[PDB]
Amino acid sequence: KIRIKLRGFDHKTLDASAQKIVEAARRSGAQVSGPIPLPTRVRRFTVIRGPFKHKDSREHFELRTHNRLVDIINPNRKTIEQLMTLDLPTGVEIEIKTV
Amino acid sequence: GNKIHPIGFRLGITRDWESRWYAGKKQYRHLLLEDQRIRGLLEKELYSAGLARVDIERAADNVAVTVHVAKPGVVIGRGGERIRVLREELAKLTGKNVALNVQEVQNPNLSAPLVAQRVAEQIERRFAVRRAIKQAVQRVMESGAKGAKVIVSGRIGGAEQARTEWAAQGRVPLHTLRANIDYGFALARTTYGVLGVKAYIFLGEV
Amino acid sequence: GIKSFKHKGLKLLFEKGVTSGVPAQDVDRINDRLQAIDTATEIGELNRQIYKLHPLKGDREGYWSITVRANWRITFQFINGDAYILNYEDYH
Amino acid sequence: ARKALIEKAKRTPKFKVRAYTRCVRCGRARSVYRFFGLCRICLRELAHKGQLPGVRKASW
Amino acid sequence: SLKKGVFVDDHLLEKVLELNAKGEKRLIKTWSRRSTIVPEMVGHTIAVYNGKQHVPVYITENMVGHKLGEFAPTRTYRGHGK
Amino acid sequence: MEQYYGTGRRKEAVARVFLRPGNGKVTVNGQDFNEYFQGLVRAVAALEPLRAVDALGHFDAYITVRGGGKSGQIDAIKLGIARALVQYNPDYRAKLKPLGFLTRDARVVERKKYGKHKARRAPQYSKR
Amino acid sequence: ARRRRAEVRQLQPDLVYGDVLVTAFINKIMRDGKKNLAARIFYDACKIIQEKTGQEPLKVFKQAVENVKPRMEVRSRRVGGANYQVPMEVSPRRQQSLALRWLVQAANQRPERRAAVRIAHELMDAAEGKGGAVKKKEDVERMAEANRAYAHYRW
Amino acid sequence: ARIAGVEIPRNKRVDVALTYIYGIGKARAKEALEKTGINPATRVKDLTEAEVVRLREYVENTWKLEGELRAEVAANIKRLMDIGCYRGLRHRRGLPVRGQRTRTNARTRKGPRKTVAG
Amino acid sequence: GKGDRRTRRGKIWRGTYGKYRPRKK
RNA sequence: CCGGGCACUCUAACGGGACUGCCCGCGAAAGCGGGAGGAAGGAGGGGACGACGUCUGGUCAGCAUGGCCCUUACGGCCUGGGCGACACACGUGCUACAAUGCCCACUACAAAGCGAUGCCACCCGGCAACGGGGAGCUAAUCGCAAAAAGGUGGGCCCAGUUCGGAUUGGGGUCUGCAACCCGACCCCAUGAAGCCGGAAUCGCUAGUAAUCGCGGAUCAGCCAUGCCGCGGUGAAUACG
RNA sequence: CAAGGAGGUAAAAAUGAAAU
Ligand SMILES: [Mg+2]
Ligand SMILES: [Mg+2]
Ligand SMILES: [Mg+2]
Ligand SMILES: [Mg+2]
Ligand SMILES: [Mg+2]
Ligand SMILES: [Mg+2]
Ligand SMILES: [Mg+2]
Ligand SMILES: [Mg+2]
Ligand SMILES: [Mg+2]
Ligand SMILES: [Mg+2]
Ligand SMILES: [Mg+2]
Ligand SMILES: [Mg+2]
Ligand SMILES: [Zn+2]
């Protein structure tokens, strides 16, 4: 019933921090749908390489925003207990909602 | 010439970020401006420390700020000032958790920003630049470096004629990705103008 | 007499007296050459030693060029007692 | 007109259409990205610095 | 092309209406084409600014959607060598 | 009714090919292998690996397709049909190689590169 | 400087025929990369061949190409600011290419209204040895004929 | 059939033949024959005289067309004669009315090039 | 007629819709 | 669409996968040719990556900065004008001169991206632009979008013509304090030049050229036919 | 199988550029 979403710019921190919550939910009495890899939202932009006025030949950058989903079954305060405030991100945004 | 910033050229693999936080739109713009104003405010009254980095991390009103310094001499024991209101003056336009840490950069002769900054000081001391370059390189090479390279360009020793002094010992492969190459830069302000100091420090990888 | 300007700085200096188009130390220099190019009834008069006068070559044929200072040239076309296309150009 | 001109860019009153974007790091009025609030010049500088969270070189 | 607005300058009209009761003098300026021809005060002259000076334009019916400054060219041209 | 693998891809096109051992030479997806591919000459070339083998309608085709346009889909179907008959007939390998019906064909649309007008077409100039 | 001799490109055989030639012809018909319209026109014209003559288009088209084949062509070469025109032999690859190219071009040169009827007729005319392409072929061989003088320059 | 001021178009579809009148174009064309109730794909070759009469009576009336509306259009430009606006001066000088680019182009009103050279 | 504002083709090219190109169904 | 299942497809995270390693021939070696080996090969196809230096190259109008100069002003505010001027000349382009074509109707098949101070389903008015409503969507959920070339049907029949769309009159809509100078669309009517281009001149060697539409940045709006990306169909030729 | 010596030698294609 409990749905958690984890967005992030770094994939290595995401693929690891959203895997901790798979271990911290499985070893507390619940069935956990593993790291669901939602598609990425790549936000590119292309900037002229020079401060002057050399239109041809520039250089572009991208801001990949990754999405990862995980669902746990029963909202028992046994699994809730651990995933309550035992948070270890580096700024990774987490969404917790039940529906 | 034309060569890409050896830091940006890595970023992903080798050399991580310097401001590590995540946000969507309507927030990124505000938090980046604040973030940059922290870097701007710190650099001023903390230059005497000579800061190699200014790492920043966030987590909803958490704002962690790690200041790497060769010699953290300007911290002086708890209530001995140089930290108290100093790490608290940040929250005069922030008001968030101003968690300011201090790191001890062990060898300053292996920190590119510090190397270039030491050189740029010497330019303003009216030192002989070519000899200053040579020494700084060997100094870096003396402290165990796998390769080094310092570059001062323009208006050397005053004198109407922009020059470019060049020195580099050992190995500095900029094209390679598994490089671990530290890059630093510094503005030397002189009574006759402005000149830039590049500093490249290289260690192994694989 | 001068009749046309290709340089906006020179043009303002001679017309309105606006010196914010030229170098500040070259205001008196640029003035006394323009006036001499103005009172000139023939190119022969623009022949004083300090100007280093001389017609250009190649695609710049028909053009003249007195020297203001350094590598800076006042280039123009002199025809029928008048100068045209007055330009303050670096000789490159 | 540059100092009094980066004033108006933040002042923003009097008719809603007279308000415009403006790089914060610089004072550039052109090529100002809404996402960063920066000009294309500054954005490139900081992206190479590493001071742009997540922002990375694009190769494909 | 407006439809539910169809506007004239309030300040142009203020000056134009309070000088319209039982008659007036043609001495009346402006600084905005922005307005519109305005019926009533047709037998009037509106010195419109063209960027340089105030051109006395005259109203004699015939004009409507043409605000003002169309009766106040801003450029000169006049000829191209010929 | 039945199943036989199916993974044919060509230039951003995905086709899952099944075939069910029955004399009814049939179709899939929208309408007929015709109908859905009518007016298209090269559409019927996807069934060439069946001609390469001894299949004059021995299977009931079932290919769900997606992505790309018709031609790529048709190409992908060819790769899927072949991928089926090579799967449940491992000895039918000695015809998918000489005839070359088994290749993903990495030939895909090349990226728009800056400066150039499109892929490789240079923007054209005059010196003067 | 052509270090590689540029290997000969190979095509896909068509539908119903299996030609290693017809598809090459359909390609020349093709404009803007629309093989659908291109192939249709040819097969359309194939249906048109059946009407005006009781012959199978696979031979009518085949023989037409054979009749619009340049035995030898003129080649401009060396010494004198490239002043000479040595009449050279034509490679089977080039006879191939010229035949199909001249066919389609002469076909669209015809005053007819539909592309199919132009193709069909130009093929029938060429199969006989009458087509405007056959003119082009015979013309190119005239040029090659008149240059036998310094043909011994060869190469 | 001498419909308005013209008669020319014979064997060529009435929805098309109608177009050959200054005032008809394409929209008023099918609009006129659906309102008159006549088959658009007809021969135009003098078909049922009745359909032709009804068509003529409706078309030639209703809206202004041919030489009459050419006169009105020319008179609408004559509006900006007097002491007219800016748009009138553009009709005076012979230059484009809608304020476009005249540095190059604008040949459809200026006319073919004259070339000054200097 | 990619530039004629009275075609489904010109309306495509221009982007906008209208009478000569309705917003589907 | 549900029950349920997730093997297929897809999503994105680490991996495996050729190193001419194996066969024949050549060679002193490097290597080269050829052949089963497989999805793939003798740098697989594309990216990012640009040596010492050169051009007194470019950039004081992104920014920093030495020197010179201006300070009731070369600074500051405002309304208006101008950057959009046009006898002409050149560059890069867009749309065409048509029938492998145009118009109308029906009917398919993409990718890469953007959106809750917005994208706006579905209804209602309206020829339409658009306006009234109003559901869903913090978005592999809802929406932008039906991709277009294609196919099927039907109509023009080669004539400046159902080609071509400029220019101009009129009537409207939307943003905006306001669109005269100078905004984009919508509708009516006009329908020009052009029937394929002189001397010259450009691009591209395989998903390539050509051709077709789609997205995004900037952005109230837009003069975008531009630029940066996406996929659809898909040639020709290389003797030398 | 490894060249020493003898001989027929390209055309149409001119100029310089603006302080050391
Ligand atoms: Mg360009
Ligand atoms: Mg393409
Ligand atoms: Mg204009
Ligand atoms: Mg011209
Ligand atoms: Mg490399
Ligand atoms: Mg220079
Ligand atoms: Mg400056
Ligand atoms: Mg301009
Ligand atoms: Mg004509
Ligand atoms: Mg014609
Ligand atoms: Mg190539
Ligand atoms: Mg001479
Ligand atoms: Zn900036």
Instruction: For residue A21, give the CATH number of its domain.
Output: 3.30.70.600
Give me the domain span that covers residue B42. 16-106
| Start-to-end Cα distance in chain E | 38
Q: What are phi and psi of D32, to 5 degrees?
A: -90, 110
What is the torsional sign of CA F96, F98, F104, F108?
negative
Closest-CA residue of H relative to E59 is: H83
Contacts 24+ apart (CB under 8 A), A9-14: A9/A63, A9/A64, A9/A65, A9/A66, A9/B22, A9/D53, A9/D54, A10/A90, A10/B20, A10/D54, A11/A64, A11/A66, A13/A89, A13/A90, A13/A92, A14/A66, A14/A68, A14/A92
Total number of domains in chain A: 1
Q: Domain containing H57 — which CATH number?
A: 1.10.8.50
Distance CA H55, CA E67 (A): 43
Residues B38 and B53 in one domain: yes
Strands (E), chain G: 72-76, 85-89
Query: Chain E contacts of H76, Cβ < 8 Å?
Result: none
Residue B154 CA to residue B165 CA, distance in Å, equals 8
Place of tokens 């062990």: B106
The kind and range of the H/E element at B122 are helix B112-124
Number of domains into which chain F is organized: 1
Contacts of F42 in chain G (CB under 8 A): 15, 35, 39
How is chain D split into domains, by residue range?
Answer: 1-60
Per the annotation, where are the binding residues of D for Zn(2+)? 23, 26, 39, 42
Residue pair G75/G138 in contact (Cβ under 8 Å)? The answer is no
Cβ neighbours around B165 below 10 Å, total = 19
Rounded CA separation E19/E41 (Å) = 9
Of the three residues B55, B86, B106, the one that is the final residue of a domain is: B106
Phi, psi values for residue B99, rounded to 5°: -80, 90
Distance, CA H101 to ligand 8 centroid (Å)?
A: 12
Q: Are residues H63 and H16 in the same domain?
A: yes
Task: Name G residues 19-78 whose Cβ lies under 7 Å from strand J.
Answer: 24, 27-38, 40-41
B100 and B113 in a single domain? The answer is no
Instruction: Quote the strand ranges of B37-98, DSSP E.
Output: 51-57, 64-69
Any domain includes B7: no
CA atoms within 13 A on the CB side of G2: 3
Give, as one character, the DSSP assignment of residue F121. B
H105 and H50 share one domain: no
CATH of the domain at H93: 4.10.910.10
Domain range for F116: 2-128
Q: How far apart are CA F36 and CA F22, in angstroms?
A: 22
E58: in domain: yes
Bases of chain J with protein Cβ within 7 A: 8-14, 36-40, 44-54, 56, 58-59, 62-69, 74-96, 99-105, 108-117, 127-130, 139-140, 145-152, 155-158, 161-170, 172-193, 201-211, 213-214, 217-220, 225, 227-240
What is the rounded CA–CA span in Å between residue A73 and residue H26? 67
Alpha helices in F45-94 (DSSP H): 48-52, 70-85
Q: What are phi and psi of G98, to 5 degrees?
A: -65, -40
Q: Which nucleotide's C1' atom has the smallest distance to the CA of C92?
A: K18
- Distance in Å from the first CA to the final CA of chain A: 6
Elucidation method: X-ray
Residues by CB within 7 A of strand K: list them: C 52, 54, 56-60, 65, 67, 70-71, 73, 91-92; G 80-81
Residue B183 to residue B134: CA distance in whole angstroms: 17
Joined tokens for residue A51: 């401060």
Closest CA to B111 of B31, B50, B30: B50
Residues 56-115 of F with CB under 8 A from A: 114-115
Q: Per residue in H73-98, is it b (16+ CB within 10 Å) or e — as a string? A: eeeeeeebeeebbbbbebbeeeeeee
List Cβ neighbours of H61 (8 Å cut-off, separation of 6 or more): none
Kindly state the tokens that stand for C43: 């190119």
Instruction: Give CA–CA dist F45/F74, Å, rounded.
Output: 8
Q: Could you tell me if F64 and F28 are in contact, meaning their C-beta atoms sit under 8 angstroms apart?
A: yes
Range of the domain at E15: 6-82
Residue H67 shares a structural domain with residue H103: no
- Domain ranges for chain G, please list them: 1-155
Cα F10 to Cα F51, F65, F109, distances in angstroms: 21, 11, 11
Reduce the DSSP state of residue E19 to 3 states and report it. Answer: coil
Strand partners, B69: B51, B104
**Nucleotide with the nearest C1' to C71 CA:** K19
Q: H116 to chain E: which residues are within 8 Å by CB?
A: 80-81
DSSP E strands in chain C: the ranges are 64-69, 72-79, 82-90
Running DSSP on this structure, what letter comes out for residue B154? S
Q: For residue H49, give its domain range.
A: 1-71
**Cα–Cα dist F27/F29, whole Å:** 7
Please, what is the angle between helix C8-15 and helix C27-38, to 10°? 80
Instruction: Say yes or no for a CB contact (<8 Å) between A63 and D47.
Output: no
DSSP state of B11: S
Contact status, residue D32 vs residue D24, Cβ threshold 8 Å:
no
Determine whether C7 is an active site residue.
Answer: no
CA–CA separation, F58 and F43 (whole Å): 20
Sequence-ordered list of residues with C-beta below 8 angstroms from that of H98, at least 6 positions apart, any chain: none
The structure tokens listed for H28 are 């008023």
**With b meaning 16 or more CB within 10 Å and e meaning fewer, what string describes E16-37?**
beeeeeeeeeeebebeebebbb
F43's CB contacts (< 8 A; 6+ apart) are F33, F37, F70, F74
Is E78 part of a structural domain of the chain? yes
Whether residue B98 contacts residue B83, with contact meaning beta carbons closer than 8 Å, is answered with no
Selecting from 3.30.70.260, 2.40.110.10, 1.10.3470.10, 4.10.830.10, what CATH number does the domain D1-60 have? 4.10.830.10
Q: How many Å apart are CA G140 and CA G89, to the nearest integer?
A: 12
Who's near G59: CB < 8 A, 6+ residues apart?
Answer: none
Within 8 A by CB and 6+ apart from B39, the residues are B54, B56, D51
Question: What letter does residue G8 receive in the DSSP assignment?
Answer: P
Q: Are B65 and B96 in contact (CB under 8 A)?
A: no
Q: What is the dihedral of CA F4, F10, F15, F17, to 10 degrees?
A: -20
Residue type, F8: G
Q: Determine the distance in angstroms separating the CA of F30 from the nearest CA of chain A, rounded to an integer.
A: 29
Q: What is the distance of C-alpha F93 from the center of its chain?
A: 18
Which amino acid, F44?
A: V
Burial class (CB in 10 A: 0-12, 13-18, 19+), D38: buried
Q: What share of chain G is helix, strand, coil (3-state, %, to 5)?
A: 55, 5, 35
Return d(Cα E22, Cα G130) in angstroms, integer.
Answer: 97
Q: Cα–Cα distance between F80 and B62 in angstroms, integer? A: 54
Q: What is the CA radius of gyration of chain I?
A: 8
In a domain, E1, yes or no: no
Note whether B114 and B82 are same-domain residues. no
Q: Angle between the G35-52 and G115-128 helix axes, to the nearest 10 degrees?
A: 50
Q: Residues 38-97 of A near strand J (Cβ < 7 Å)?
A: 38-46, 50-53, 55-60, 66-67
Q: Are F55 and F93 in contact (CB under 8 A)?
A: no
What does the alpha-carbon distance between residue F125 and residue H114 come to, in Å, rounded to a whole number? 28
Residues B187, B117: contact at Cβ < 8 Å?
no
Angstrom distance (rounded) from CA G83 to CA G97: 27
What amino acid occupies position D2?
R
Cα–Cα distance measured from residue I20 to residue G64, given in angstroms and rounded to the nearest whole number: 47
CA distance B31 to chain A (A): 13
Sheet strands side by side (includes B181-190): B164-170, B147-153, B193-202, B181-190
What is the number of domains present in chain H?
A: 2
Last residue of a domain, one of B106, B138, B160: B106
Q: Does domain G1-155 have CATH number 1.20.1250.20?
A: no
- Nearest-angstrom CA–CA distance, D55 and D43: 10
Q: How far is H73 from G11, CA to CA, in rounded Å? A: 63
Q: Is the same domain home to B132 and B92? A: no
Buried b (16+ CB within 10 A) or exposed e, A13-30: bbeebbeebeeebeebeb
Q: Which residues of F touch G36 (CB under 8 A)?
A: 39-41
- Residue C12 to residue C30: CA distance in whole angstroms: 12
